[PDB]
Design a binder for these strands. Structure first.
Ligand SMILES: [K+]
Ligand SMILES: [K+]
Ligand SMILES: [K+]
Ligand SMILES: [K+]
Ligand SMILES: [K+]
Ligand SMILES: [K+]
Ligand SMILES: [K+]
Ligand SMILES: [K+]
Ligand SMILES: [K+]
Ligand SMILES: [K+]
Ligand SMILES: [K+]
Ligand SMILES: [K+]
Ligand SMILES: [K+]
Ligand SMILES: [K+]
Ligand SMILES: [K+]
Ligand SMILES: [K+]
Ligand SMILES: [K+]
Ligand SMILES: [K+]
Ligand SMILES: [K+]
Ligand SMILES: [K+]
Ligand SMILES: [Mg+2]
Ligand SMILES: [Mg+2]
Ligand SMILES: [Mg+2]
Ligand SMILES: [Mg+2]
Ligand SMILES: [Mg+2]
Ligand SMILES: [Mg+2]
Ligand SMILES: [Mg+2]
Ligand SMILES: [Mg+2]
Ligand SMILES: [Mg+2]
Ligand SMILES: [Mg+2]
Ligand SMILES: [Mg+2]
Ligand SMILES: [Mg+2]
Lengths: 66, 98, 99, 50, 91
RNA sequence: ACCGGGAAGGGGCGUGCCCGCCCGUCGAACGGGGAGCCGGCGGAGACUCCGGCAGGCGCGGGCGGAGACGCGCCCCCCGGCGACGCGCACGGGGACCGCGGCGGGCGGCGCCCCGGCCCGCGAACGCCCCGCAGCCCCCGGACGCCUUGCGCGGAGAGGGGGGCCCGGGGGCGGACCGCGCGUCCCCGGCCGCCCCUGAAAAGCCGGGGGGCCCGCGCGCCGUACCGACCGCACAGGACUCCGGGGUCAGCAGCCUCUAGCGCGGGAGCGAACGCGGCUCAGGGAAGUCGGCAAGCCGGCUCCGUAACCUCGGGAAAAGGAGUGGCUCUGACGGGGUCAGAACUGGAACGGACGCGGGGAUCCCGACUGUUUACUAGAAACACAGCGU
């Protein structure tokens, strides 16, 4: 597992390298399941809005909160 | 140090009879600070509101565990086995039957 | 409490490659974890001192660039041994010929 | 031992499998009065050298 | 303050083995623990590492010598006589 | 059957060339070895199952720096890793262990009690930062730098600024908060020691010279349980690993948390005599082949110690005195120790436990060591030394 800067996150999505994304509410955790590593990005909810709209329609998103 | 507050709810203390002044009176005379009782009225004040004891202080802070100790001491007189003291929230205790 | 553990390896004979350390797990448990032997790094062919720049990892696990130094005789000679070979070569040519 | 060769495991496996009584229908079929199989063995008093 | 009067380094032996042996060891063992001079370093840092083997702790040069001292008296004379025989070979 | 090099002893490829001195896919379930962690599930299996997160080995779709140093292959030769002893101490990390706070839960309670007990958890692996010693670079040219100990310097110290290694730590991922004395384990730099100098190979890599992201897979065997083993079944014999608290010099003795709980069966009586124990007035070896057996001594601190001697010893020689509890004071840079004083108790204090009796001599063997497994441990054997 590893962390990632936001700009690298879309490029992995942009090249179809992700398999599933999870949004976690606590500061929000976004977890992307690639072939090699699980990657985690932490942003405030203001920032995660725009990123998910950019979300690749070929990339399954799920949500999670409790 | 600053001022913090605690409270003990005796809502189940209605069908059996429990004065709220006595329990307040019990705590008023027994509270110790630094193993002494001179200079308490000027730090720790027992109120009676909502049928529940309230301990507001001013400049004095201490553990919520001691507020539970004085409760089982005062309850030991004619309630040996009636009540179990449990935590409901932050600063509030609750008296519960068996 | 009681923190005693059992052996992790096939037999309990405590040779130099069967040493563990202890660690607490997220389920509140004391686990054993093997402590690998650390190989030496390469040593100079003329002086027997550690060559600078190479980590103490077996070279199978290091990328090609990580296994080298950027100089003639990079991982064979310690830098001072190179300079002494260079001077001996140049000066003997100056004395075996032209007096 | 917990660390045994497959060849010793197989010969031990056969002594376990054949360590049995005579079936009761065999006693009716063959009209027997000796009913004990005297080639049985028990682990506490045996010396299987296998 | 001086701790013994005669035995020196052979105080490690106690009352054992007799006087003639301990007398021999005091001389031998003092000699093999000594610091000798690098014939190359010119510094006083040569120490024995095994019987016959002497290393400068500053040069790092290794040398072949005596069992309990760097130079023996037979080898000094041999080196001196061999040198004069070579120079005599020169015309 | 036993013994053995002196034999025209095989490979790369692609024909055809080229290279070549001559065994072992025998011998280690503790040595060497490419790579695994957490959580969960079952009546009986788990580093093997399931879920999650990784790692290894395979297969298919010429630049920067002043410098120390930083950022595809093939053959011949030269090297490296694998790869290594013992030791008193000193230093660092981890785990353990304690004290205090704060959060949740218990117990008992004649008096006292914020004083008792239990629970407060974070792996492998990936990225960034930080790492004492130690070795290296640059300037420049010396009455210093520095360790518990040492050690180092014109073959270039100190000082200023840098590079590399470091089984480790931190932060983010994976996903409660402080402070301490010790204990064990590993690691580090030194120093000491030897007529003792403390394996090998597979495998993997570097140098010099010459020629030139996405998929799929990982076969074979062991794996239950046990001191259930050997002594005809049994107070015997039978290798290793993990190791809390109090008292204490302590892995001793004595008590204990966790965990675990057999040992061919019970009851009554309280004779002799036995077996293992305890105490005895007065005397004190008169007993006996013989002080056999038993008893005296014993921890720690201070005082005080002869003959003789291979000058190292003798030596705990011999002999003396003190020692609890409580209330305090001083010294050392938060921590135990060391020193001293008042008061007090049948005229007591290493209060159990643990723990030398001593001295004057003669014979034998110098000494530590070895032996008749099952009646002999010695004066016998060995030994360094000496000699042929
Ligand atoms: K088994
Ligand atoms: K058996
Ligand atoms: K023959
Ligand atoms: K072998
Ligand atoms: K072995
Ligand atoms: K093996
Ligand atoms: K080895
Ligand atoms: K080379
Ligand atoms: K198993
Ligand atoms: K009787
Ligand atoms: K009798
Ligand atoms: K007598
Ligand atoms: K006796
Ligand atoms: K005292
Ligand atoms: K003897
Ligand atoms: K001895
Ligand atoms: K005998
Ligand atoms: K004997
Ligand atoms: K003896
Ligand atoms: K003998
Ligand atoms: Mg083999
Ligand atoms: Mg092995
Ligand atoms: Mg099991
Ligand atoms: Mg070895
Ligand atoms: Mg098992
Ligand atoms: Mg008597
Ligand atoms: Mg007599
Ligand atoms: Mg008589
Ligand atoms: Mg003797
Ligand atoms: Mg003896
Ligand atoms: Mg005998
Ligand atoms: Mg005997």
């Amino acid at each position: 597992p590893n962390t990632i800067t936001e700009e690298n996150l879309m490029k992995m999505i942009a090249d179809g390298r992700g398999k599933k994304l999870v949004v976690k509410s606590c500061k929000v955790k976004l977890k992307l399941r690639t072939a090699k590593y699980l990657y985690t990005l932490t942003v405030p909810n203001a920032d995660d809005a725009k990123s998910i709209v950019k979300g690749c329609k070929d990339k399954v998103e799920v949500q999670y909160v409790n | 140090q600053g001022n913090i507050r605690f409270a003990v709810d005796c809502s189940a203390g209605k069908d059996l009879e429990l004065n709220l002044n006595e329990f307040a009176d019990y705590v008023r005379t027994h509270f110790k600070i630094n193993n002494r009782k001179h200079g308490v009225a000027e730090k720790v004040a027992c109120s009676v509101e909502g049928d529940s004891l309230v301990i507001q202080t001013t400049g004095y802070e201490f553990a919520k565990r001691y507020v539970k100790y004085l409760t089982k001491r005062f309850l030991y007189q004619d309630y040996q086995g009636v009540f179990r003291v449990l935590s409901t929230d932050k600063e509030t205790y609750t008296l519960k039957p068996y | 409490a009681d923190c005693r553990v059992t052996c992790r390896f096939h037999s309990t004979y405590r040779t130099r490659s069967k040493i563990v350390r202890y660690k607490r797990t997220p389920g509140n448990r004391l686990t054993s974890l093997r402590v690998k032997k650390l190989p030496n790094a390469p040593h100079c062919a003329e002086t027997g001192k550690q060559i600078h720049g190479i980590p103490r990892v077996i070279p199978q696990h290091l990328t090609r660039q990580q296994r080298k130094v950027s100089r003639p005789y990079g991982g064979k000679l310690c830098g001072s041994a190179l300079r002494a070979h260079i001077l001996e070569s140049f000066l003997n040519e100056e004395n075996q010929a032209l007096r | 031992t917990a660390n045994k060769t497959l060849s010793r495991k197989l010969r031990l496996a056969k002594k376990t499998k054949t360590n049995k009584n005579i079936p009761r229908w065999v006693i009716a079929k063959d009209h027997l009065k000796k009913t004990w199989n005297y080639k049985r063995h028990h682990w506490r008093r045996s010396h299987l050298k296998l | 303050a001086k701790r013994t009067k005669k035995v020196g380094l052979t105080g490690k032996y106690g009352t054992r083995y007799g006087r003639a042996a301990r007398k021999q060891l005091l001389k031998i063992e003092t000699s093999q623990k000594a610091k000798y001079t690098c014939p190359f370093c010119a510094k006083d840092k040569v120490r024995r590492t095994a019987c016959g083997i002497w290393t400068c702790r500053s040069c790092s040069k290794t040398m072949a010598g005596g069992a309990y001292s760097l130079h023996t008296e037979p080898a000094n004379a041999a080196r001196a006589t061999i040198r004069r025989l070579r120079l005599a070979r020169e015309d």
